Design a protein around this nucleic acid. Structure first.
Ligand code: MG
Ligand code: MG
Ligand code: MG
Ligand code: MG
Ligand code: MG
Ligand code: MG
Ligand code: MG
Ligand code: MG
Ligand code: MG
Ligand code: MG
Ligand code: MG
Ligand code: MG
Ligand code: MG
Ligand code: MG
Ligand code: MG
Ligand code: MG
Ligand code: MG
Ligand code: MG
Ligand code: MG
Ligand code: MG
Ligand code: MG
Ligand code: MG
Ligand code: MG
Ligand code: MG
Ligand code: MG
Ligand code: MG
Ligand code: MG
Ligand code: MG
Ligand code: MG
Ligand code: MG
Ligand code: MG
Ligand code: MG
Ligand code: MG
Ligand code: MG
Ligand code: MG
Ligand code: MG
Ligand code: MG
Ligand code: MG
Ligand code: MG
Ligand code: MG
Ligand code: MG
Ligand code: MG
Ligand code: MG
Ligand code: MG
Ligand code: MG
Ligand code: MG
Ligand code: MG
Ligand code: MG
Ligand code: MG
Ligand code: MG
Ligand code: MG
Ligand code: MG
Ligand code: MG
Ligand code: MG
Ligand code: MG
Ligand code: MG
Ligand code: MG
Ligand code: MG
Ligand code: MG
Ligand code: MG
Ligand code: MG
Ligand code: MG
Ligand code: MG
Ligand code: MG
Ligand code: MG
Ligand code: MG
Ligand code: MG
Ligand code: MG
Ligand code: MG
Ligand code: MG
Ligand code: MG
Ligand code: MG
Ligand code: MG
Ligand code: MG
Ligand code: MG
Ligand code: MG
Ligand code: MG
Ligand code: MG
Ligand code: MG
Ligand code: MG
Ligand code: MG
Ligand code: MG
Ligand code: MG
Ligand code: MG
Ligand code: MG
Ligand code: MG
Ligand code: MG
Ligand code: MG
Ligand code: MG
Ligand code: MG
Ligand code: MG
Ligand code: MG
Ligand code: MG
Ligand code: MG
Ligand code: MG
Ligand code: MG
Ligand code: MG
Ligand code: MG
Ligand code: MG
Ligand code: MG
Ligand code: MG
Ligand code: MG
Ligand code: MG
Ligand code: MG
Ligand code: MG
Ligand code: MG
Ligand code: MG
Ligand code: MG
Ligand code: MG
Ligand code: MG
Ligand code: MG
Ligand code: MG
Ligand code: MG
Ligand code: MG
Ligand code: MG
Ligand code: MG
Ligand code: MG
Ligand code: MG
Ligand code: MG
Ligand code: MG
Ligand code: MG
Ligand code: MG
Ligand code: MG
Ligand code: MG
Ligand code: MG
Ligand code: MG
Ligand code: MG
Ligand code: MG
Ligand code: MG
Ligand code: MG
Ligand code: MG
Ligand code: MG
Ligand code: MG
Ligand code: MG
Ligand code: MG
Ligand code: MG
Ligand code: MG
Ligand code: MG
Ligand code: MG
Ligand code: MG
Ligand code: MG
Ligand code: MG
Ligand code: MG
Ligand code: MG
Ligand code: MG
Ligand code: MG
Ligand code: MG
Ligand code: MG
Ligand code: MG
Ligand code: MG
Ligand code: MG
Ligand code: MG
Ligand code: MG
Ligand code: MG
Ligand code: MG
Ligand code: MG
Ligand code: MG
Ligand code: MG
Ligand code: MG
Ligand code: MG
Ligand code: MG
Ligand code: MG
Ligand code: MG
Ligand code: MG
Ligand code: MG
Ligand code: MG
Ligand code: MG
Ligand code: MG
Ligand code: MG
Ligand code: MG
Ligand code: MG
Ligand code: MG
Ligand code: MG
Ligand code: MG
Ligand code: MG
Ligand code: MG
Ligand code: MG
Ligand code: MG
Ligand code: MG
Ligand code: MG
Ligand code: MG
Ligand code: MG
Ligand code: MG
Ligand code: MG
Ligand code: MG
Ligand code: MG
Ligand code: MG
Ligand code: MG
Ligand code: MG
Ligand code: MG
Ligand code: MG
Ligand code: MG
Ligand code: MG
Ligand code: ZN
Lengths: 204, 59, 12, 118, 131, 122
RNA sequence: CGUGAGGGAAAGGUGAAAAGAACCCCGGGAGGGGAGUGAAAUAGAGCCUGAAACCGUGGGCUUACAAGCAGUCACGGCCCC
RNA sequence: GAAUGCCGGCAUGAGUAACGAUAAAGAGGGUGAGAAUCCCUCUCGCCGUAAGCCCAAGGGUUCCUACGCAAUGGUCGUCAG
RNA sequence: CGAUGUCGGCUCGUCGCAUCCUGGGGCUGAAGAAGGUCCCAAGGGUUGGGCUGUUCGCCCAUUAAAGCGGCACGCGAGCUGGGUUCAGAACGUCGUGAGACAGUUCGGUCUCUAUCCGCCACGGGCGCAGGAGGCUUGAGGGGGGCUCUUCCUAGUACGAGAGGACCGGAAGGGACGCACCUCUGGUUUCCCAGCUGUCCCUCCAGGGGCAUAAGCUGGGUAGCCAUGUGCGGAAGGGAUAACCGCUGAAAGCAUCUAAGCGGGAAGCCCGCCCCAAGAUGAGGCCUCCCACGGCAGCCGGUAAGGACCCGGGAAGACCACCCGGUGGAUGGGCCGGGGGUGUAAGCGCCGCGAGGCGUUGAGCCGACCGGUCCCAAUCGUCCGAGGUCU
């Protein structure tokens, strides 16, 4: 169960076999392993990964100590890939071959305080025929005296996006090791420049 | 709408609990490196007119 | 099921 | 949502907001230093900087461009002749904003000064 | 890192250079590879280009023609490998970038609005002179 | 994008001229019919003494749409009108001729008889 | 208040005596601090007494794993006499 | 201790709705204890079969000037009916 | 009865199962395919139209199916107001009359401000016996849970013929969901151009205001988007339902059962995605600071760190979150590119002239990808462990 940290760079399409392929480009490698989690020491199995070079002027003394125990230069982002144990002391895009199938986790674009029609795809009210100031309103949110309350989880307006989203079973279309690039077919969560995580897919 | 209205008078206790966030934070002030008088940071000193080690303004 | 209304509609 | 949008609205409609910028340019370019609220101040920078950078070009086209915003033939004449030349070797950044320490009494609005640079 | 550069880098494998320059208003014939059964063959589509979206490797253009009494528009990607070649059949001069308005014009009216771009024609004869 | 209430030009010589879609035949609840779909339609306008007359409820396959249709090669195609060809229940055309171009999608979807009758396939 | 006939309020108290607070101080003023008057000035004119609701300041006990007509009975902790 | 009682006082909702046409503002100078709000200049916008002007009702000193800002002004006020 | 707003629609659901569909079964007057009938099963699904205020019902066209009921005949401090209960008017009918009618007809004021509980979101506080910066385990929750067609097996089994499989294997759709913006397609309030009337600058030329809160028109970047794109439902493991057995007494036979063991569903548990240690049962790992002064406590100075302040941000109502603060590319300028518009002004030439041609893909030019210390994030300040007890 391999994995790698990365950043979404943007989308294009390429041509493969007289076919246009929508792709998202991800700058994935190189990721230095800075800690290994072991069942004897940590109770589970995972590999703590680092990503992006960091100005050591910004890294506080608690963090500096951590990086030294791994003999690894300062890094901007730490994230763990679970049930992964690479042979090397560094992870690159090489662990994926074109044709493979992956899961990508990212942070969805935030739509802030979102109405019920955008958030929950409600149908709202009429725009004529007497509709009175309720065009984007939810309608009823309950019954009467029984039960005399509102369900937990009741779909209502509120914040939406800026949340963890994982898209699955995405085809690796190409991998360009010289530039730490990963070409994945389709749409990946988050804005360009946003951080992603690329793991081997759990689908069949 | 059917004109919602309070059901019970708010107790002195509950009123005052609502106001547990209403406290003012005192202004954030640093000394002016020229005249030692206190002033908001990142603002041209209204006492001596100095900012970034130079005179900027008549006071 | 159409049953007779028990209240008049409210007036000013 | 406002994702990657540039330019304040300043609670004025299109034409009013434009007028605001033009009149503040006329004011800044006339006295060299004006006082406004911090938001208006920051927005004023680029609006004037572009005008100044065009006076540096000098051509008739540039004069006719800058004249669309400034209107005052005397003022523009001062811009090309007196103002522009002291920025010949300077590349952008012809204006500066410095925040004042005291607020306005009647509305607590935060003030700052905008000025042409030496 | 430069996100734009990295995108442009991916695209550079597929970027095409053999295709001739043209403008909205030019009449153009596109030799397009087409599969039908059980072979692939090259079908020509020839008409006025009414639109050119620009976006680097992802620019696309739109060619319009009348076929047997029915108007047909086609959208091609300028760097699509399925375009064998493009032949300028006529240069026409528009005053606009997008010529959606010709959809509602009779053949006579179009001919008057899209006059022959005499400048870029002589210019095309100015090249096309081999050494 | 043809949906119920849509008028379609008939592109054959069945005598029909204009049909109005009343159901798109593509599962339990298809929202729109596109190129190569079969619809049930009422005949709203027809020419005298044709095979089909005004009022008949016929079937037809869509041959060209005004909403552009997209192709895996990255290109797309758009027509000036919405057209269909009236068929029998065996997907065979009921007329003897078809007028105007038809979309290449008809071939892939097994309407060989209509494709062969068309003057042009784009 | 009502066109009008007509309707129709609220509002008493410094001190024995103004002796009603000169002057100085902060303040644009209002207000206050001293000084002075008086038996008394939380009798200072917004003046006898000055209850209650209501608002505040300071002190003691107490409260952020807890289910309530708010009390009551028991024990214990802390503070006070 | 209750009469949706009467008269008064003070709470709650609450620092909440609102601050009365979406014709629109910006700077500089002046005044002053205090200025987004008063004066002056320049720029900008709105009315123009009026949002201009002149009568008649009706109102009754609101007119002009000087000195003022406790209250009135839905904010502020050095300004003002 | 000092008020519990009354039909139907819309919206939003949630439950029941006496199950319409899909899954699993036994019997069949079950050849096959298709039906009938009963049993198990509530996970999901359960279409668009015409008539009428209608619920209901009839009808059209489809479908896997077009399920029935509860929730104050769910839902008017959520909307509607067609029906029915006001005042107007008329028809039929009844009444001498005023008027009346589970008869009809046309018309007819639906109340900006949410205190508490509840619900969707987001913080402040304290706690988590040293103080801190990271990274995690997942107790427990939530989301999801659909299905069809065609093809291969195979025109095989079966059947006189028509017709037509079980099992296993492929491909392709409908609807729903999450994400996305490369393409397609929108918007893009001033990014560009054209145009009319009027006033103005400055007379021509060139321009500005106004005609909307864009005067009108043609286009249109980033962003936000769906009609556009990607992906999801599973797989798989476990335990079961009806149901079918293995072995087997009581009961020399028989019996799925009384001892024991199998097989068996879209359902149940795990698995997938998301939340989550206020999980006060307050978990775990890595790393950093330390025995500071005066009198489980009080005051004070620090450490590791943190906050304040500032430049900002596909983060955002405030707050929170994330980045940066001269040790700097954080925003604004400027430069390069992209991108839109579509050949600026000026001059020259041709026409009497409106104009035309050239200079010229020119000029202008928001957000996009970058570069550059030109302008601004100056200077600082305040919090902040001494580690209870067996
Ligand atoms: Mg390839
Ligand atoms: Mg992440
Ligand atoms: Mg809504
Ligand atoms: Mg949504
Ligand atoms: Mg939607
Ligand atoms: Mg709807
Ligand atoms: Mg709608
Ligand atoms: Mg409606
Ligand atoms: Mg209404
Ligand atoms: Mg209403
Ligand atoms: Mg409305
Ligand atoms: Mg509602
Ligand atoms: Mg209840
Ligand atoms: Mg958030
Ligand atoms: Mg309402
Ligand atoms: Mg209401
Ligand atoms: Mg309400
Ligand atoms: Mg209302
Ligand atoms: Mg209210
Ligand atoms: Mg109440
Ligand atoms: Mg109270
Ligand atoms: Mg209190
Ligand atoms: Mg409260
Ligand atoms: Mg401040
Ligand atoms: Mg001084
Ligand atoms: Mg946002
Ligand atoms: Mg908006
Ligand atoms: Mg930006
Ligand atoms: Mg702007
Ligand atoms: Mg903005
Ligand atoms: Mg801002
Ligand atoms: Mg304003
Ligand atoms: Mg405002
Ligand atoms: Mg305007
Ligand atoms: Mg305007
Ligand atoms: Mg710029
Ligand atoms: Mg500053
Ligand atoms: Mg003031
Ligand atoms: Mg790009
Ligand atoms: Mg590169
Ligand atoms: Mg051909
Ligand atoms: Mg043509
Ligand atoms: Mg035809
Ligand atoms: Mg007829
Ligand atoms: Mg009266
Ligand atoms: Mg009177
Ligand atoms: Mg009376
Ligand atoms: Mg009285
Ligand atoms: Mg007395
Ligand atoms: Mg007396
Ligand atoms: Mg004095
Ligand atoms: Mg004095
Ligand atoms: Mg004064
Ligand atoms: Mg005094
Ligand atoms: Mg005092
Ligand atoms: Mg005194
Ligand atoms: Mg004495
Ligand atoms: Mg005595
Ligand atoms: Mg006393
Ligand atoms: Mg006394
Ligand atoms: Mg008293
Ligand atoms: Mg007395
Ligand atoms: Mg008193
Ligand atoms: Mg008292
Ligand atoms: Mg107290
Ligand atoms: Mg507990
Ligand atoms: Mg406790
Ligand atoms: Mg006790
Ligand atoms: Mg009593
Ligand atoms: Mg009362
Ligand atoms: Mg009362
Ligand atoms: Mg009451
Ligand atoms: Mg009373
Ligand atoms: Mg009483
Ligand atoms: Mg009272
Ligand atoms: Mg409130
Ligand atoms: Mg509010
Ligand atoms: Mg308000
Ligand atoms: Mg109002
Ligand atoms: Mg107003
Ligand atoms: Mg308006
Ligand atoms: Mg001023
Ligand atoms: Mg001034
Ligand atoms: Mg003022
Ligand atoms: Mg003042
Ligand atoms: Mg006039
Ligand atoms: Mg008079
Ligand atoms: Mg009067
Ligand atoms: Mg008077
Ligand atoms: Mg007079
Ligand atoms: Mg007077
Ligand atoms: Mg005066
Ligand atoms: Mg006053
Ligand atoms: Mg005053
Ligand atoms: Mg005053
Ligand atoms: Mg007042
Ligand atoms: Mg006032
Ligand atoms: Mg008033
Ligand atoms: Mg006057
Ligand atoms: Mg009642
Ligand atoms: Mg009552
Ligand atoms: Mg009551
Ligand atoms: Mg059952
Ligand atoms: Mg079945
Ligand atoms: Mg069944
Ligand atoms: Mg059978
Ligand atoms: Mg049979
Ligand atoms: Mg059966
Ligand atoms: Mg179910
Ligand atoms: Mg259920
Ligand atoms: Mg149901
Ligand atoms: Mg209808
Ligand atoms: Mg009926
Ligand atoms: Mg069927
Ligand atoms: Mg069936
Ligand atoms: Mg139906
Ligand atoms: Mg009901
Ligand atoms: Mg019901
Ligand atoms: Mg209502
Ligand atoms: Mg209702
Ligand atoms: Mg109700
Ligand atoms: Mg109801
Ligand atoms: Mg209700
Ligand atoms: Mg009605
Ligand atoms: Mg009616
Ligand atoms: Mg009826
Ligand atoms: Mg009625
Ligand atoms: Mg009625
Ligand atoms: Mg009648
Ligand atoms: Mg009669
Ligand atoms: Mg009768
Ligand atoms: Mg009768
Ligand atoms: Mg009679
Ligand atoms: Mg009679
Ligand atoms: Mg009746
Ligand atoms: Mg009417
Ligand atoms: Mg009213
Ligand atoms: Mg009311
Ligand atoms: Mg509340
Ligand atoms: Mg918290
Ligand atoms: Mg907190
Ligand atoms: Mg952090
Ligand atoms: Mg769990
Ligand atoms: Mg819990
Ligand atoms: Mg076969
Ligand atoms: Mg046989
Ligand atoms: Mg199968
Ligand atoms: Mg499928
Ligand atoms: Mg784009
Ligand atoms: Mg687009
Ligand atoms: Mg596009
Ligand atoms: Mg587009
Ligand atoms: Mg512009
Ligand atoms: Mg002119
Ligand atoms: Mg004009
Ligand atoms: Mg004007
Ligand atoms: Mg005007
Ligand atoms: Mg206007
Ligand atoms: Mg304009
Ligand atoms: Mg468009
Ligand atoms: Mg437009
Ligand atoms: Mg766009
Ligand atoms: Mg869609
Ligand atoms: Mg299973
Ligand atoms: Mg089993
Ligand atoms: Mg046996
Ligand atoms: Mg047993
Ligand atoms: Mg078993
Ligand atoms: Mg078993
Ligand atoms: Mg078995
Ligand atoms: Mg399934
Ligand atoms: Mg987590
Ligand atoms: Mg914890
Ligand atoms: Mg956690
Ligand atoms: Mg517990
Ligand atoms: Mg912990
Ligand atoms: Mg553990
Ligand atoms: Mg420090
Ligand atoms: Mg912000
Ligand atoms: Mg920081
Ligand atoms: Mg600093
Ligand atoms: Mg620094
Ligand atoms: Mg920068
Ligand atoms: Mg920059
Ligand atoms: Mg370019
Ligand atoms: Mg270009
Ligand atoms: Mg030209
Ligand atoms: Mg020119
Ligand atoms: Mg001439
Ligand atoms: Mg450029
Ligand atoms: Mg600098
Ligand atoms: Mg540098
Ligand atoms: Mg300092
Ligand atoms: Zn100073």
């Amino acid at each position: 169960m391999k994995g790698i940290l990365g950043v979404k760079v943007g989308m294009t399409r390429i041509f493969r076999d007289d076919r246009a392929v929508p792709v998202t480009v991800i700058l994935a490698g190189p990721c230095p392993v800075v800690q290994r989690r072991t069942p004897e020491k940590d109770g589970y199995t995972a590999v703590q990964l680092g990503f992006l070079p960091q100005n050591p002027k910004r890294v506080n003394r608690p963090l500096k100590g951590h990086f030294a125990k791994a003999g690894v230069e300062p890094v901007r982002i730490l994230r763990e890939i679970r049930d992964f144990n690479p042979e090397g002391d560094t992870v690159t895009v090489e662990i994926f071959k074109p044709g493979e199938r992956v899961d990508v986790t990212g942070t969805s674009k935030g739509r802030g305080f979102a109405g019920v029609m955008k958030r929950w795809n409600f149908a709202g009210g009429p725009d004529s025929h007497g509709a009175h100031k309720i065009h984007r309103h939810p309608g009823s949110i309950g019954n009467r005296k029984t039960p005399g309350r509102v369900y937990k989880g009741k779909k209502m307006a509120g914040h939406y996006g800026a949340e963890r989203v994982t898209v699955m079973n995405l085809e690796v279309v190409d991998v360009i090791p010289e530039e730490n690039l990963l070409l994945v077919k389709g749409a990946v969560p988050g804005p360009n420049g946003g951080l992603v995580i690329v793991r081997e897919t759990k689908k069949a | 709408a059917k004109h919602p209205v309070p059901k019970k008078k708010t107790s002195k206790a509950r009123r005052d609990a609502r106001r547990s966030h209403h406290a003012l934070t005192p202004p954030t002030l640093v000394p002016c490196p020229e005249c030692k008088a206190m002033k908001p940071p990142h603002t041209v000193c209204p006492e001596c007119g100095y900012y970034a080690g130079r005179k900027v303004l008549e006071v | 099921v159409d049953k007779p209304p028990y209240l008049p509609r409210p007036r000013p | 949502m406002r994702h990657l949008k540039s330019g304040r609205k300043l609670n004025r409609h299109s034409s009013h907001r434009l007028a605001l910028y033009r009149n503040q340019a006329k004011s800044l370019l006339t006295h060299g230093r004006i006082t406004t609220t911090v938001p208006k101040a920051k927005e004023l920078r680029g609006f004037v900087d572009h005008l100044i950078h065009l006076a540096k070009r000098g051509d008739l086209h540039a004069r006719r461009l800058v004249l669309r915003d400034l209107q005052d033939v005397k003022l523009v004449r001062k811009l090309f002749d007196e103002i522009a030349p002291r920025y010949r070797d300077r590349q952008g950044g012809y204006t500066r904003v410095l925040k004042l320490a005291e607020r306005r009494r009647g509305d607590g609005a935060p003030l700052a000064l905008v000025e042409l640079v030496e | 890192m430069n996100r734009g550069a990295l995108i442009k880098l991916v695209e550079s494998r597929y970027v095409r250079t053999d295709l001739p320059e043209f403008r909205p208003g030019d009449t153009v014939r596109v030799s397009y590879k087409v599969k039908e059964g059980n072979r692939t063959r090259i079908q020509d589509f020839e008409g006025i280009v009414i639109r050119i979206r620009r976006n680097g490797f992802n620019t696309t253009f739109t060619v319009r023609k009348v076929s047997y009494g029915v108007g047909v528009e086609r959208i091609f990607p300028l760097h699509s490998p399925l375009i064998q070649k493009i032949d300028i059949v006529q240069r026409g001069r528009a005053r606009r970038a997008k010529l959606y308005f010709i959809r509602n014009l009779s053949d006579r009216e179009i001919r008057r609005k899209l006059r022959a771009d005499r400048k870029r024609i002589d210019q095309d004869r100015a090249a096309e002179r081999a050494a | 994008m043809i949906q119920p209430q849509t008028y379609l030009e008939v592109a054959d010589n069945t005598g029909a001229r204009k049909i109005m879609c009343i159901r798109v035949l593509k599962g339990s609840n298809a929202k729109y019919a596109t190129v190569g779909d079969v619809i049930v339609a009422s005949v709203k306008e027809a020419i005298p003494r044709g095979a089909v007359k005004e009022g008949d409820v016929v079937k037809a396959v869509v041959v060209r749409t005004k909403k552009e249709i997209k192709r895996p090669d990255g290109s797309a195609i758009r027509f000036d009108d919405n057209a269909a060809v009236i068929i029998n229940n065996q997907l065979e055309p009921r007329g003897t001729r078809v007028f105007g171009p038809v979309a290449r999608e008809l071939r892939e979807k097994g309407f060989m008889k209509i494709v062969s009758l068309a003057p042009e396939v784009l």
